[PDB]
């Protein structure tokens, strides 16, 4: 899917996760690409992969 998640846009696949990362809502790689995000409601983590 073509996504725009917390104002970061791209194309990838979204999955559910297993992590409980407490800090922040967007997680990025060194290149800057979006690796995951959190829903500021329940708090679930999701992952993003090309």
């Amino acid at each position: 899917t073509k996504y725009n998640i917390y104002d970061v846009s791209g194309v990838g696949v979204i999955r559910i996760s297993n992590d409980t990362f407490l800090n922040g809502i967007t997680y990025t790689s060194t290149s800057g690409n979006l690796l995951g995000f959190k829903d500021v409601t329940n708090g679930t983590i999701y992952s993003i992969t090309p």
Binding site: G10, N33, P50
Partner: protein, 49 residues
Amino acid sequence: EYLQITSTPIVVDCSTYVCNGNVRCVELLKQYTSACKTIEDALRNSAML
């Protein structure tokens, strides 16, 4: 006495690094015919030898 006998090989996909899987970028990249081929041949043949 210590002597190094190997260096860990690394290969890079030229299209993915430069265009990040964007379908329009890779189409423009294809005019750079001699660019990716030189890079990929250099890294690949080093690993084979």
